[PDB]
Design a binder for this molecule. Structure first.
Ligand SMILES: CC(C)(COP(=O)(O)OP(=O)(O)OC[C@H]1O[C@@H](n2cnc3c(N)ncnc32)[C@H](O)[C@@H]1OP(=O)(O)O)[C@@H](O)C(=O)NCCC(=O)NCCS
Ligand code: NA
Length: 273
């Protein structure tokens, strides 16, 4: 009698191996897989069951409002209490790639921003980030995930950038909830670095902290830590600023050569609470 652990999930054409344990309310059996519908995120212990439900009429994108949509990606705003089942299913899936996450069942306190790539085949959920409706610490991101099959493609950077666009529209500075996983922190540092580097070449050669905070919603702390790592912290005309140098132009051109996608602030049609 084999009592196996969840060693792989079937999502679309991908067979994915979990990084961490997730509290799926499933029976332990001699099999080590479950099916995860790439639309409803619902889980099944048998291909047959998955099949039965695949046939039923359902939307082909996240159950939320599409508040951002460009030729590359779309962002859907989902309210936990308004879509408990779907969101609980999203947290269960997310917990497979996070060392720690709050009780997946309690989704009412969060707002979920899900990102999709649109193909001739429709919407494909590639990542998302959650956010506390009310955060005592002003965190603008609770948990953030790029589905593993789509990692290392720039989507995570898009997710972080979008989270900052909400904060800008909200007229508040924000920072991701601490502590961060090594993966998340390295993604954030790359993002903070690319942002200051782009601001210094496309906006102004010298920028004060307030100006950077105003244009990016980044916190003083994250701005200063980033400016120090790049060695661009200086004092000019009475206040601390970040300045442009040769290394920056170089890094910028390299970044640009990578021809990456970004978030167009003008395409965010959204009003904060
Ligand atoms: C942290 C996380 C969101 C990052 O997401 P991601 O989709 O991999 O992020 P990005 O792709 O934007 O990261 C940029 C990296 O992708 C690489 N990349 C992007 N497009 C590429 C392409 N076409 N060819 C080669 N590399 C590419 C970048 O070069 C960069 O590599 P580097 O980090 O060594 O410099 C993801 O690892 C994740 O969901 N992890 C599990 C959850 C977690 O730890 N969350 C943080 C807790 S708050
Ligand atoms: Na996080």
């Amino acid at each position: 009698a084999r009592v196996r652990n969840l060693n792989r999930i079937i999502m679309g054409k991908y067979e994915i191996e979990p990084w961490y344990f997730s509290p799926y309310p499933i029976e332990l059996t001699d099999e080590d897989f479950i099916y995860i519908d790439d639309f409803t995120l619902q889980y099944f212990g048998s291909k047959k069951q998955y099949e039965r439900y695949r046939k039923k009429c359902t939307l082909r994108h996240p159950p939320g409002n599409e508040i951002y949509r460009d030729d590359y990606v779309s962002f859907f705003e989902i309210d936990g209490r308004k879509q408990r089942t779907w969101c609980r299913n999203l947290c269960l899936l997310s917990k497979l790639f996070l060392d720690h996450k709050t009780l997946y069942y309690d989704v009412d306190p969060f707002l979920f921003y899900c990102m999709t790539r649109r193909d001739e085949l429709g919407h494909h959920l590639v990542g998302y980030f959650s956010k506390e409706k009310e955060s005592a610490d002003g965190y603008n991101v609770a948990s953030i995930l790029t589905l593993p099959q789509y990692q290392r493609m720039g989507y995570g950077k898009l997710l972080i950038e979008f989270s900052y666009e909400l904060s800008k529209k909200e007229n508040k500075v924000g920072s991701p909830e601490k502590p961060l996983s090594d993966l998340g922190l390295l993604s954030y540092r790359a993002y903070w670095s690319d942002t200051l580097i782009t601001l210094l070449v496309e906006h102004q050669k010298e920028i004060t902290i307030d100006e950077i905070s105003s244009m990016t919603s980044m916190t003083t702390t994250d701005i200063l830590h980033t400016a120090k790592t790049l060695n661009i912290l200086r004092y000019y005309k009475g206040q601390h600023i970040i300045f442009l140098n040769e290394d920056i132009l170089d890094r910028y051109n390299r970044l640009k050569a990578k021809k990456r996608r970004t978030i167009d602030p003008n395409r965010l049609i959204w009003k904060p609470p």
